[PDB]
Amino acid sequence: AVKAPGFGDRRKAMLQDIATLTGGTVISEEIGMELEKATLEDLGQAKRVVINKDTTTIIDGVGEEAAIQGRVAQIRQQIEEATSDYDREKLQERVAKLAGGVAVIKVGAATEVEMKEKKARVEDALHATRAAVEEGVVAGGGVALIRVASKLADLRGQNEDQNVGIKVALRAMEAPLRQIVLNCGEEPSVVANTVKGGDGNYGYNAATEEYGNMIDMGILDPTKVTRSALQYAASVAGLMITTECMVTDLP
Amino acid sequence: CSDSKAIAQVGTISANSDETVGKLIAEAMDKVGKEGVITVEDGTGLQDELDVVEGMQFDRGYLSPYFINKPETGAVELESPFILLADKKISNIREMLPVLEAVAKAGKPLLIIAEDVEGEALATLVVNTMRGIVKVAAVKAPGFGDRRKAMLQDIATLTGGTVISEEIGMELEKATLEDLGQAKRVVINKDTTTIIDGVGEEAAIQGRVAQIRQQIEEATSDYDREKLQERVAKLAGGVAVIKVGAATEVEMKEKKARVEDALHATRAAVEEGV
Amino acid sequence: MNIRPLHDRVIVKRKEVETKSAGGIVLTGSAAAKSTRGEVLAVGNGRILENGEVKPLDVKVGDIVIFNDGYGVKSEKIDNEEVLIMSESDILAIVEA
Amino acid sequence: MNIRPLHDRVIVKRKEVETKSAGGIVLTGSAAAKSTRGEVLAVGNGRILENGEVKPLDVKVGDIVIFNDGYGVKSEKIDNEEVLIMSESDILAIVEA
Numbered sequence: 241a242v243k244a245p246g247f248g249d250r251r252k253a254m255l256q257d258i259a260t261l262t263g264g265t266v267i268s269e270e271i272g273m274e275l276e277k278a279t280l281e282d283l284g285q286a287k288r289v290v291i292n293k294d295t296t297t298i299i300d301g302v303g304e305e306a307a308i309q310g311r312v313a314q315i316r317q318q319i320e321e322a323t324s325d326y327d328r329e330k331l332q333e334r335v336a337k338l339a340g341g342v343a344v345i346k347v348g349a350a351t352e353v354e355m356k357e358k359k360a361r362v363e364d365a366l367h368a369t370r371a372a373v374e375e376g377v378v379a380g381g382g383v384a385l386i387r388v389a390s391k392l393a394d395l396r397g398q399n400e401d402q403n404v405g406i407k408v409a410l411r412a413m414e415a416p417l418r419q420i421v422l423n424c425g426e427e428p429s430v431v432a433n434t435v436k437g438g439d440g441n442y443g444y445n446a447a448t449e450e451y452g453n454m455i456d457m458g459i460l461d462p463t464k465v466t467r468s469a470l471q472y473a474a475s476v477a478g479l480m481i482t483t484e485c486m487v488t489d490l491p
Numbered sequence: 492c493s494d495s496k497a498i499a500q501v502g503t504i505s506a507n508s509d510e511t512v513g514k515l516i517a518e519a520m521d522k523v524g525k526e527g528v529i530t531v532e533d534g535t536g537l538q539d540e541l542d543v544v545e546g547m548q549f550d551r552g553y554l555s556p557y558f559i560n561k562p563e564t565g566a567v568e569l570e571s572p573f574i575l576l577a578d579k580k581i582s583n584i585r586e587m588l589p590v591l592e593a594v595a596k597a598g599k600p601l602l603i604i605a606e607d608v609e610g611e612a613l614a615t616l617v618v619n620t621m622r623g624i625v626k627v628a629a630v631k632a633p634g635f636g637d638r639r640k641a642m643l644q645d646i647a648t649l650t651g652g653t654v655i656s657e658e659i660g661m662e663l664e665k666a667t668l669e670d671l672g673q674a675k676r677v678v679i680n681k682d683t684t685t686i687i688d689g690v691g692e693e694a695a696i697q698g699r700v701a702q703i704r705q706q707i708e709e710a711t712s713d714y715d716r717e718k719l720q721e722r723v724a725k726l727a728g729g730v731a732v733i734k735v736g737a738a739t740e741v742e743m744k745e746k747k748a749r750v751e752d753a754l755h756a757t758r759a760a761v762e763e764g765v
Numbered sequence: 766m767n768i769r770p771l772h773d774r775v776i777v778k779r780k781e782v783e784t785k786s787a788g789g790i791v792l793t794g795s796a797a798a799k800s801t802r803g804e805v806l807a808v809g810n811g812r813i814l815e816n817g818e819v820k821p822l823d824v825k826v827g828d829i830v831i832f833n834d835g836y837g838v839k840s841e842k843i844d845n846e847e848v849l850i851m852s853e854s855d856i857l858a859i860v861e862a
Numbered sequence: 863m864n865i866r867p868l869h870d871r872v873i874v875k876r877k878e879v880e881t882k883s884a885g886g887i888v889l890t891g892s893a894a895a896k897s898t899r900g901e902v903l904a905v906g907n908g909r910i911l912e913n914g915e916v917k918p919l920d921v922k923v924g925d926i927v928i929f930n931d932g933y934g935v936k937s938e939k940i941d942n943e944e945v946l947i948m949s950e951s952d953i954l955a956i957v958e959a
């Protein structure tokens with residue numbers, strides 16, 4: 241005997257998972273099934289089960305996959321909701337436990353200071369890959385923004401001021417690349433130019449400090465992150481330059 | 492200021508030349524009619540959105556998921572049901588029972604509204620809706636005590652039933668089919684309840700809306716004006732909500748501020764002209 | 766395997782009717798629920814007062830009866846089946862065919 | 863389908879609710895009065911007291927009676943009808959039409 245998996249209501253939902261998976265039926269006190277009366281057919285079946293101090297495990301369900309996959313598919317309607325990822329972690333967890341699997345990456349390090357930073361880069365890469373998978377990828381090294389900026393050169397607005405605003409943005413999309421170059425202590429003007437001289441995915445490889453095709457060099461930025469970064473930057477900077485006055489507490 | 496064009500204009504002007512907002516308000520004011528309510532909340536996504544709920548709908552869900560009829564959508568549909576309106580929370584099924592037996596012989600489903608429905612009653616009710624003895628559903632009354640008790644009479648007169656008030660000489664054990672309210676349809680999900688085409692007299696409805704207009708001029712502004720007109724909307728007109736899109740929270744503040752400004756301004760145009 | 770009640774005591778098995786049936790046609794019930802009726806399996810000698818004699822137990826056997834469930838009744842289980850033991854004083858009435 | 867109560871016990875149906883006008887002074891009310899009267903459905907053989915054999919109850923059937931209801935009265939449902947089972951000692955006097 242083991243406690244049921246989650247906190248009460250979510251867990252009550254998870255009992256049905258276990259039930260349909262093992263071809264058994266949940267005994268629900270709030271219905272006209274009583275806890276005292278149950279038959280051998282009410283029980284679920286499994287190939288084997290294994291329990292330790294930590295987790296409980298079912299080695300297989302004896303229930304047919306039609307009904308089961310019916311439930312894995314029908315939980316997908318529950319996947320999108322106002323709760324963002326809070327539900328998604330344990331819900332996709334649920335879906336996986338029924339269909340897929342769960343994975344955990346243990347990050348190795350010698351000392352705690354290395355451990356924290358290393359794990360940070362790992363979680364970063366995880367988010368990045370999920371984003372890549374979801375929205376696709378574009379050429380890295382900040383060559384993306386500059387590449388689209390070159391396509392927007394003919395874009396103009398309602399008045400001259402708006403024109404200048406557009407030109408400001410297009411200039412600012414060069415920033416990431418110039419900064420990447422700059423951290424090497426190299427001419428951003430020259431590299432940015434020789435990149436603007438190029439076409440397609442031609443860009444600067446900062447680790448090898450040489451030019452080349454980015455995608456062929458396996459330098460990839462998930463489209464989602466470039467898209468988001470640009471969108472968010474413009475959102476706040478746009479408002480921030482409209483400031484004619486500032487009010488605060490006294491020093 | 493009358494036509495939706497002009498409304499859209501003053502909206503646009505007050506909103507600092509955001510035309511979208513101006514058109515949105517004119518559109519909303521057109522859809523919910525006069526007396527209908529328009530409010531604005533922070534939007535999930537980057538684009539502006541206008542939501543419109545027509546008629547009588549309140550925000551409470553089915554108390555048990557087992558009540559579900561006609562799934563999926565996890566919804567419960569009752570065709571021409573009886574509405575039961577109770578001022579008190581329902582614990583025992585004894586006090587509950589006579590009216591329910593009266594409805595089961597009646598041929599019709601039953602809808603329940605109270606402070607709450609406690610275990611013994613829910614359990615008995617669920618088992619009975621499961622056995623296929625009766626089609627039934629139960630939801631909480633809309634507001635906090637004075638608010639909900641105030642809205643119970645609204646829903647009552649809308650559906651032509653009478654609220655059972657322990658605080659008057661009606662006790663729930665003694666209840667009649669005439670004490671029950673009637674409606675064309677009712678639809679309930681985990682979130683909201685809806686009463687479609689209530690059978691209550693148009694006389695009674697305009698009577699209670701008129702009776703609420705005396706409450707409209709009440710000396711306490713903001714929410715009192717807001718939540719009261721809300722009730723009115725539910726009886727006669729409809730309710731609308733404008734969700735403000737933004738990339739970041741500061742942009743959300745700026746846009747939403749401009750939106751409420753445009754909202755008040757358009758209302759002002761309707762009232763006093765331009 | 767047959768137990769014989771003594772004196773004023775009788776032994777009956779309750780019929781499980783799944784309670785009510787409230788109060789008319791037809792409803793179920795959740796709390797305050799249990800079989801209040803049953804058939805008499807066996808009967809004791811009778812009451813003893815003043816030793817006028819032992820006046821038996823106005824309740825014959827294989828009668829269908831209504832009774833009150835108090836503390837006085839206790840349930841015991843014979844082979845394969847649970848049955849209850851009570852005193853005639855605890856018996857309210859008898860149904861006739 | 864007549865059920866017979868045993869010994870001193872009789873079975874009675876509860877009488878009506880609310881309040882009279884009593885000359886006109888009395889009107890419906892929150893304060894509840896619950897069945898202090900009833901009509902008797904059936905009656906037992908009689909009481910047996912310390913060799914005082916069977917004394918036939920002084921209460922005929924279809925009599926209208928007043929009673930005080932303690933635990934001694936039990937509520938049971940016969941023929942889908944709510945009824946009370948009580949001892950004649952628990953029964954107060956009887957009113958004539």
Ligand SMILES: Nc1ncnc2c1ncn2[C@@H]1O[C@H](COP(=O)(O)OP(=O)(O)O)[C@@H](O)[C@H]1O
Pocket residue numbers: 379380381382420444445446447448459460461
């Ligand atoms: N070897 C490389 N050569 C050129 N550009 C690179 C290389 N590695 C990463 N980049 C670019 O630098 C950026 C990485 O920025 P990083 O330092 O991880 O901070 P953040 O991810 O928050 O911007 C990515 O856009 C990537 O395209």
